[PDB]
Design a protein around this nucleic acid. Sequence first.
DNA 1: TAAAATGTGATCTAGATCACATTTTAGGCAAAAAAGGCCTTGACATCCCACCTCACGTATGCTATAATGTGTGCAGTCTGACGCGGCG
Length: 78
Amino acid sequence: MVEANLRLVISIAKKYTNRGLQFLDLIQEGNIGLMKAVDKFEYRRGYKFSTYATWWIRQAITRSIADQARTIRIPVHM
DNA sequence: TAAAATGTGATCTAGATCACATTTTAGGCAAAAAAGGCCTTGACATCCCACCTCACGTATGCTATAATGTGTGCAGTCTGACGCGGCG
């Protein structure tokens, strides 16, 4: 599953590899959200998988950029 | 020889005498008491300490139409010598 959907991970990743942090870190975090979605996904919902891990990936990257990527940590609320 | 010094002598005038009683008052010796030095007491004032203390802030979780191989805006190519790994 994971080795299959790596291209989803990288595709979504490089929408956000504008000069925020760096490519490969967005990619790696994307693989983390991917592994979550593989751990959680239900076939019985019968939907496509792409959407599910799209959400999960996007969460993971979207707050790893914010936790990291600065010398001064601004937490999520600000 | 000009100009300053020298005798008339009786009539006075501010202080000293002189023995003894009474003050004083030292000065200096004993000290009473008061006001510092010693401590205490009551009363205040201000805390240090810390002991709590709720609101706001913060660490973390999912969101099911679906979407799946970068690139990406740069460098302008300095150059002469010296090592080293191919390169026959």
